[PDB]
Structure formats: structure tokens, C-alpha cells
């Protein structure tokens, strides 16, 4: 952030920056993820292969990373991020929970056992998944407000 006009560019700067970017996606701060992306418009462009892997991963995340989970891993085994990619990998997304499986789709053990099964919430996915008077109280207040204006 410091002006640091004398700042001598080093290949580390690009490598370290991507580590935040890769981590940021890991900590599901997606808004922050793009925030950093727009901070380095001159870096991403088409060069800076160092940080190119996370963006591809992010695109795959907004797209079907679930299928592309191992595609990006195989796209480049390492970019000085041998451990860096590890955090993301172990942080497998699980938003697919809003579906049916477990003798209803059966595919997507330990996963089927975690917290009893999947992540824990709901039940066995195969078996997982009006009133005016209540409106009366709420409406009553609203109507008076209109009258309250006609006071003065």
C-alpha cells in the first residue's frame, strides 16, 4: 500500500499475492476475493501465471468446480503453491446439500457417515424433503398509520 516508488518488483510479490487470493476463496470471502482481483488488473491480464491458477479455480467455482475440482488441480500441479492448493482442496465445498441422495440418488461412506451422515443436518436424504387473523394484527397497525397522517 505504501507508495514506495523505489519498491523493487520481485517474483515473490506475485506468488504471495495469489496465496491470499487462493486463501480468500478458501475462507468463502468471495466478495473479498474479487476485491483483490481488481487490485491487480495489470497482473492478471494474460501474464503472471503465478496467480492464474486461483482465478481459473474461481471461475470453476462460479461454474461447476464440483466437476472441475480435480481439473484445476491437474491443470498445473504446482505454482509455488504446493501447500497453498492444499487448503483449498481439503476445504471441499458442500453446497450440493440442497438435493436428494442416499437411496434416492445414491451418488454425488465416510461422507455418508459424517455427523451420522453428510454434514449432519436434515435426515436421510431419501426421506428428507393461509391465515387472515394473524394478518389481522399486522394490518390493523398499518391502517391506523394512514389515519394518523390525516390528523394534521
Amino acid at each position: 500500500f505504501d507508495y514506495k516508488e523505489q519498491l523493487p518488483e520481485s517474483a515473490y510479490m506475485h506468488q504471495l499475492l495469489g496465496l491470499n487470493l487462493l486463501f480468500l476463496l478458501s475462507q468463502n470471502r468471495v466478495a473479498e476475493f474479487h476485491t483483490e482481483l481488481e487490485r491487480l488488473p495489470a497482473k492478471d491480464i494474460q501474464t503472471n501465471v503465478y496467480i492464474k491458477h486461483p482465478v481459473s479455480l474461481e471461475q470453476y467455482l462460479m461454474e461447476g468446480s464440483y466437476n472441475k475440482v480435480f481439473l484445476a488441480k491437474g491443470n498445473i500441479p504446482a505454482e509455488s503453491y504446493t501447500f497453498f492448493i492444499d487448503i483449498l482442496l481439503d476445504t471441499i465445498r458442500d453446497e450440493i446439500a440442497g438435493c436428494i441422495e442416499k437411496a434416492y440418488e445414491k451418488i454425488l461412506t465416510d461422507y455418508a457417515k459424517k455427523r451420522g451422515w453428510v454434514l449432519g443436518p436434515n435426515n436421510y436424504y431419501s426421506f428428507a424433503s393461509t391465515t387472515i387473523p394473524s394478518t389481522e394484527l399486522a394490518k390493523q397497525v398499518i391502517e391506523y398509520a394512514r389515519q394518523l397522517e390525516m390528523i394534521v
Binding site: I132, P133, E136, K139, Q140, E143, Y144, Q147
Partner: peptide, 16 residues
């Protein structure tokens, strides 16, 4: 104003 606001308020009698 008065007529229909009273009619709407009648919901208070109607529902509670």
C-alpha cells in the same frame, strides 16, 4: 377516505 378506512378497519372486528 373515512368510509373505506372504516371499512378496512372493520377487519379488526372481523378477525380478532
Amino acid at each position: 377516505m373515512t368510509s373505506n378506512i372504516v371499512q378496512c378497519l372493520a377487519a379488526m372486528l372481523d378477525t380478532v
